Symmetry: D2
Subunit: 381 residues, 4 copies
């Protein structure tokens, strides 16, 4: 009584879906470096030996897709056929067209920037919670940090048997204080990570407990009853796109709040700011974080929605879980007085023409690195 379990997951940089997200954002950044107004909707698919780029780009940039893609795969760490994938020798296929003129004319052609229409219809959510300093659920924060630690240990040579493809999952036991949530302990941790053929299972499991989990999880959350599922499959030599097809926008919950809050369904990666799936979700996080860091609530969910070609949101909704003294209608009035959620204004407030998107494409878009949507707005009311 009083307590509940909640589970979130994360994946590593070499997870095949995350490879695609990073590639799509490497392509977007490559365009934005030359043409800040590039319209980009780049999807990536990865399978054994293949990166395929599909989608719509209208840009003045001259982009060497072979170079951009292969350098992103190189950074991930897939550089030899022994690892199952190699940037030097894989197939890069490109099926990219111009943005449809019907779309262009409906959304941005001949518009003043501040009044550009939403690039599509859709709904988007932002969330924030005071349970961590990052204003993110602990479950997802820990899941991400476990994967980041694996990559650190791989890249510094502490654990040279590690590969790039990894998944993690953290279940935390919580209690609730008046609609806010308070983490008590880590209940279960799962880690699966691709490895070389020479390392034995007990060495891997020992290292994952001692060098990864204990290096990442605050000791106050771990106890003798914590359940560890470390390399639970027994063997994970084949990995990366060879083991499992990857697509852009197939880790949208990993990218956001790990099951907490809500999601409107739109992927982030490979999309420029006129795609409100990305710009308005970023803005909504910025709103949610601003409400919490401003002391107006402890936990909050923000919904916004759009129609293609229409610049203002169709709806805005605030849910505070009972964690404010203000009514949800009062918070909504405060949001409406302080934020302009048109895509052509968000772009200016969050500096969304800057080529920083590849950095967002692993370890979550929120809760790290003081990106502009992570810097709270000082609210007037």
């Amino acid at each position: 009584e009083g307590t509940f379990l909640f589970t979130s997951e994360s994946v590593g940089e070499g997870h095949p879906d995350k490879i695609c997200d990073q590639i799509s954002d490497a392509v977007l950044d490559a365009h934005l470096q030359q043409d800040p107004d590039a319209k980009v909707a780049c999807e990536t698919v990865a399978k054994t030996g293949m990166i395929l780029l599909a989608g719509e780009i209208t840009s003045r940039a001259a982009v060497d897709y072979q170079k951009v893609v292969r350098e992103a795969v190189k950074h991930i760490g897939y550089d030899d056929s022994s690892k199952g994938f190699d940037y030097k020798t894989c197939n890069v296929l490109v099926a990219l067209e111009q943005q449809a003129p019907d779309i262009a004319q409906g959304v941005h052609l001949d518009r003043n920037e501040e009044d550009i229409g939403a690039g599509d219809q859709g709904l988007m959510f932002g969330y924030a919670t005071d349970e961590t300093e990052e204003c993110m659920p602990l479950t997802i924060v820990l899941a991400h940090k476990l994967n980041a630690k694996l990559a650190e240990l791989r890249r510094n040579g502490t654990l040279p048997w590690l590969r790039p493809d990894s998944k993690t999952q953290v279940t935390v036991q919580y209690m609730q204080d008046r609609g806010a949530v308070l983490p008590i302990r880590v209940h279960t941790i799962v880690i699966s990570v691709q490895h070389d053929e020479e390392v034995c299972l007990d060495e891997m499991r020992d290292a994952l407990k001692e060098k990864v989990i204990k290096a990442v999880v605050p000791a106050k959350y771990l106890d003798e009853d914590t359940i560890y599922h470390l390399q639970p499959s027994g063997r994970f030599v084949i990995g990366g796109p060879q083991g499992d097809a990857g697509l852009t926008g197939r880790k949208i919950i990993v990218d956001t709040y790990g099951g907490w809050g809500a999601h409107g369904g739109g992927a982030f990666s490979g999309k420029d700011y006129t795609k409100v799936d990305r710009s308005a979700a970023y803005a909504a996080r910025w709103v949610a974080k601003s409400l919490v860091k401003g002391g107006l609530c402890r936990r909050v969910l923000v919904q916004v929605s759009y129609a293609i070609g229409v610049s203002h949101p169709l709806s805005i909704s605030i849910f505070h879980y009972g964690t404010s003294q203000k009514s949800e209608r009062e918070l909504l009035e405060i949001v409406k007085k302080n934020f302009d959620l048109r895509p052509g204004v968000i772009v200016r407030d969050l500096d969304l023409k800057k080529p920083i998107y590849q950095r967002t494409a692993a370890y979550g878009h929120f809760g790290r690195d003081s990106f502009p949507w992570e810097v709270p707005k000082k609210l007037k009311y």
Copy 2:
């Protein structure tokens, strides 16, 4: 005060992401018709003139991928280059391998069926709400029905200018009664639908209001202040994969609860029952619907999670929004007494080897057609 807006969206059968979901499930069904134990993880990508199949299948079935894919595209209604895509003449590319042996050995090889391991780690949610007879949010129910009506009118020749690619979005104004939600009115409707070159915009907008919206939305929810954004882009001749790349599992919120409840991130389409992203999400809906139709609550969210190779769930969580007299811990005990959420048991309870998955792949997986996960379990406690 008292009221809030909530928005959900749906897409039609010819939306490019939904084309991929249907194709992936057409491939899964084709395998299951010959081999009930087929292991299938089929991703589809669609772009101008191309369907590519990527992923992992181990099966005794002999499947003609050209036929399966082209017949699915035919059923959708893409049968002429005038529509932007044609089943007769498009490229079908196949990049399908066996399931990795490391995965096979970790999950199912040499196991008794009831004890097969989860096919992957992950988290999943089920939701139900008493606001409609289907136990689904009204916003998403209406969004789906609008798209189904467009397809009906297209296929019966009432509106021969319609094409297969459509999107809809419904914003409802709600009030809340003790954690349950009560729809009051439709606030905003968006409809975008691909059309022929000859029909003018006013004829389209008139037909969408009179023949679609008024045929679908109960008149009590529509009033003089309802906002209509009908063909808001102005022109939507290019559509289907020519206008926008499609991928499997890029409509996961449309597939489920339209933003309500929560989502764990896993796509459904192209996956057999050992993939708990599908089987355990279906089971969780079945749990949630059983709790509501059993009179134990008005609204409920269920989380479950798994580790690869481990048959029992790692966590189960019940959230009732305050709509039960029973505590969440009591509901959890009732769930645990009445359901066995191992994938190898769910498969038997929900008959998940049957080739009915193509039917799930448009208009939502939940709230329609009395699929087995939509038939409440009589609970003992």
Copy 3:
């Protein structure tokens, strides 16, 4: 006694192999329009709904591959799914990389143009015969003209049931005068041409005899014993890449001399002048035609060969079939005194940086249009 049969074939513009040749040369021309020194090795593959570009290009040009490819397919006449292929709606996939640096450094980097090395090893032949004014075998000349007539009648609407995919084959009865050949009559003609579903076979066969064959073949060569195989398959509705995969460089005998003379194996299309498969074969035709039009022989075959990185030919050989009063060694001395067969000199003599290559890619590279290799050199000796 005294007489022999000889057969050659040609194909139309919409034959799938010829589609690829035209596309590859459309890509080469697109580069050369912006960058005269572009290094291009572009292979094309065509199958139902797909054009794939594969190969190596290093160029300063910015080329819109989608536009270039689709416009070439448009010119061919594949513009509706009813025809089996449509430029508007097919898949264009691009798998193009830079020229390998090892190759670049071996062949052209840091060289004076006149001394660039051959771009590869290989052997090449040129041929000419005085039997026609074009200095080409009659069999191949007639085969080409039959296909050109089909395209004319298709494009002017005389025969609107015609499609773009066609093949023709002509067998001529010859006699020999002292190593020269003298055509006597057409023995057999084959024509297969893709057609619409509505035209009946007898109408097609009547039109092919009356409007095609009689419009093209000089009446002196046709007689009552000439054999006609017109639509010999009975039905040819499915055609173009839907019926048969196409690749660049799979019509190399159609491109040259129809079985007469000899061939060294190198394709022409998609290659810039540093590829001696194209430049030295063109030069060798130019030599052969110059010998014949200069009155030094009636019929002649020229072989040249190269090594990668080496500018001068490794061998030059002249075969006159007994049709000269000069010995083959004397003709060789005349060739060596009058031509410089280094690729960096040929490029200047034949103006091979000019973007005229798409025009070469159907109906043969030789015997038509007064291209520079078809204008005889005045010989000094």
Copy 4:
């Protein structure tokens, strides 16, 4: 005076065009092992990290394309990303359809086997020459043996720095005796072969002269004036499909007579016996070799041609270069009395349903291994 040069080339097993030929024939053999009447027209394209299969197959066989393709690449020796290509990790894409019904009905449906129609129109040549025991030109025989020696030394570890991609070219000085040709000496040899990064150029050139050339070329043909172009590019580390796109049927002169004789343009690899490009070219070699080994001539060229759907050849022509006492018309009568060149009879005489085609796909189809078309027919006249 009296003498002439002639040049031919060959390529190794790992040359990218030859990789495609071998793969296409590996696919054909895989079908024929299960279904002797399989209709196969399989084209392969190779580029960095990619094997794509395109074409038309109608067969009762169940063929695992991933396995067939990857095993062929393995046999070639591309097994690590250090070599530029790896069977374990490359992309295999499949775009294979059924044979068009229009073609099937025109050629073979409902026909007695002996009377099946030619699978296409086309012309084909056979050649034989008494200059070697294999009845092949010395230039091409030597070119092939040089590549076979490189592969031997690579596979036995004598030269571990060798890779699979190689090209060779041999120029021989000949004299002519009454239309026959008599080799006098090797004039020039070119060898280019892919190599590891660690071996220096002088070590490679020394080994190519001493361990390859001197092991293959009879010493009587080599002298102090022979020209050697060994690794003439200077550096050949990048090779295989990474360096140069490969397609099936782009080595048709290497496959046949190295420039001698003539060629009708049809590729061999990936085609079953109903494709007369392969069956009738094999038959024509068999005719030519039978004439020479029967003492009827020293050197001979045979042309045959076909129409789609027509079983008998449209033309047969014999050219003896003046090397027979019999007239060409008498040789033709002897051929017509002794051979039945219908595809449905050739299949029986040459046993063309047997899965031996992968063995034909490198080092030439003729002049080796006592294949049935290399075993002379005893002629009656």
